[PDB]
Amino acid sequence: LVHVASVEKGRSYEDFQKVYNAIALKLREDDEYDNYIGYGPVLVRLAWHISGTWDKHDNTGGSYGGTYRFKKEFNDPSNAGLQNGFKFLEPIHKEFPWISSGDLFSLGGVTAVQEMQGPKIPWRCGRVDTPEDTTPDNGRLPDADKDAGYVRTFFQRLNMNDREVVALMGAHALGKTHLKNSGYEGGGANNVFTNEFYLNLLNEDWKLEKNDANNEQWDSKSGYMMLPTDYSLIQDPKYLSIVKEYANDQDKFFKDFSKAFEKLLENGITFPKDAPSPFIFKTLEEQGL
Ligand code: HEM
């Protein structure tokens, strides 16, 4: 199964920077969502969930086909709450109807991370919408109530190693859990990209509590929380070493996150040898906008 990237006809860096800017401007404007968190975190989650269906064994799923637009994937219980991100992007797509759905969803994630003062994430175009029958079945996204062994094994399907996994999980510094979406409640409600996930794991006094949905979670008196899969990163000796590294080196975390997140967004896609190189978008701030 081969998915070859194909650049939207006649489009170049300037076209994609315009789309970036439209998303970034809307992020700034629609700032009231989720008690003033804004849409940044839910867009990062959307990019991850559309990519995280990938299976290295047969090259099914992944960001290429834009299949989240189809009912089966849109209504995956693991995707509860992402409709809010989809709605955010819908007027963007109407203004730029030439962009593919996978390109839009993935670009949304890049734009959100950058606009939240995260690292630059190189991004490549050319995902092509594929038909409804290529939509992966539900159940390929991970459970939260599990341990380190589960996390490790799970991410092997996505061709991610221990360092990639720990880097990617740092995105949990963003946003929050919502009881109605996932059965977990709480979080920092933060919309600036930092390495604070690692600092919080190492520095907070964590208590194992049961929430209103009857699920266990780790809570601190500061008001932070961790999922069991989050906490597993300090229970496993290999993960713990990497957690400590990122807690003590913000730049290293940024660099590793950028590489891992691009890889996540590109899994399953074959780029022809004459495909454009990756784009690095300027932020609104860099443009003076
Ligand atoms: C074992 C892997 C993972 C599990 C079990 C997991 C689980 C969850 C759950 C249960 C929520 C709360 C959803 C809700 O209630 O609204 C959440 C939120 C989030 N996740 Fe993960 N996640 C995982 C990996 C990742 C990765 C790899 C990324 C990105 C690189 C990511 C980014 C986020 C973001 C940004 C939010 C906040 C969304 C919001 O504020 O609306 N997650 N995750």
Q: How was this structure determined?
A: X-ray
Question: How far apart are alpha carbons 41 and 60 in whole angstroms?
Answer: 26
* Statement to judge: residues 234 and 173 lie in one domain: yes
On the 0-12 / 13-18 / 19+ scale of CB atoms within 10 A, 135 is buried
Domain containing 51 — which CATH number?
1.10.520.10
- Residue 76 Cα to ligand 1 midpoint, Å, equals 15
Work out the angle between the directed axes of helices 250-266 and 237-247 (0-180°, nearest 10).
120
Question: How far apart are alpha carbons 42 and 197 in whole angstroms?
Answer: 17
23 pocket-lining for ligand 1 (C-beta < 6 Å): no
Question: How far apart are alpha carbons 54 and 102 in whole angstroms?
Answer: 13
Question: How far apart are alpha carbons 193 and 117 in whole angstroms?
Answer: 6
Number of domains in the chain: 2
The total of other beta-carbon atoms located within 10 Å of residue 53's CB is: 28
* Statement to judge: residues 125 and 72 lie in one domain: yes
Annotated binding residue 215: no
Annotated binding residue 3: no
* Statement to judge: residues 65 and 36 lie in one domain: yes
Name the token pair of 60: 């099914």
* Statement to judge: residues 160 and 231 lie in one domain: yes
* Statement to judge: residues 69 and 81 lie in one domain: yes
- Residue 176 Cα to ligand 1 midpoint, Å, equals 8
Q: Which range marks the domain in which residue 36 is found?
A: 1-141+261-289
Q: What is the DSSP letter of 77?
A: G
Which resolution, in Å, applies to this structure? 1.6
Side chain identity at residue 110, one-letter code: V
Length of the chain: 289
Question: How far apart are alpha carbons 151 and 170 in whole angstroms?
Answer: 14
* Statement to judge: residues 14 and 124 lie in one domain: yes
* Statement to judge: residues 137 and 71 lie in one domain: yes
Contact 17, 281 (CB under 8 A): yes
CA triple 226-190-258, angle to 5 deg = 85
* Statement to judge: residues 11 and 149 lie in one domain: no
